[PDB]
């Protein structure tokens, strides 16, 4: 257990949806934005090389890549879908990336009370035995070292 070390960093994933005042000519009823961001006062660009959002195949160019912040996709649509999201790290050792499956919903299952929706998903990422450089990238992004796993 001489050089065991575990680093935990937090990512915030989320989306906002609004019913349009007029549906588009294609019949899009909603404007949405999906994002990956750091917690308050945390720059995840230190450890994040790129984020890839995999949109539904109805959307044009469905593989959306943001190599720089802001890590977000903004589009208009008529239905919610499962959007795979890849967060690629600034490292040369595994884990190179983490893949999330995000539920972009235009309304919450139970009721449609208002025209505006906000959802937030905090995800804590755990790295065991990080290399020196990636640890410092992680620590600079607000990460902390915890009990070694």
């Amino acid at each position: 257990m001489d050089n065991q070390c575990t680093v935990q960093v937090r990512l915030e994933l989320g989306h906002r949806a609004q019913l349009r005042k007029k549906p588009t000519t294609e019949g899009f009823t909603h404007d949405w934005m999906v994002f990956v961001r750091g917690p308050e006062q945390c720059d995840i660009q230190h450890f994040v090389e790129k984020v890839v959002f995999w949109l539904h195949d109805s959307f044009p160019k469905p593989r959306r890549v943001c190599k720089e912040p802001p890590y977000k996709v903004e589009e208009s649509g008529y239905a919610g879908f499962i959007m795979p999201i890849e967060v690629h790290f600034k490292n040369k050792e595994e884990p190179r990336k983490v893949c999330f499956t995000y539920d972009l919903f235009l309304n919450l299952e139970g009721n449609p009370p208002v025209n505006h929706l906000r959802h937030l998903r905090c995800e804590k990422l755990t790295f065991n035995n990080p290399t020196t450089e990636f640890r410092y990238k992680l620590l600079r992004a607000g990460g902390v070292m915890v009990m070694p796993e």
Binding site: G80, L106, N107
Partner: peptide
Amino acid sequence: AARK
């Protein structure tokens, strides 16, 4: 709401 619709889903696809």
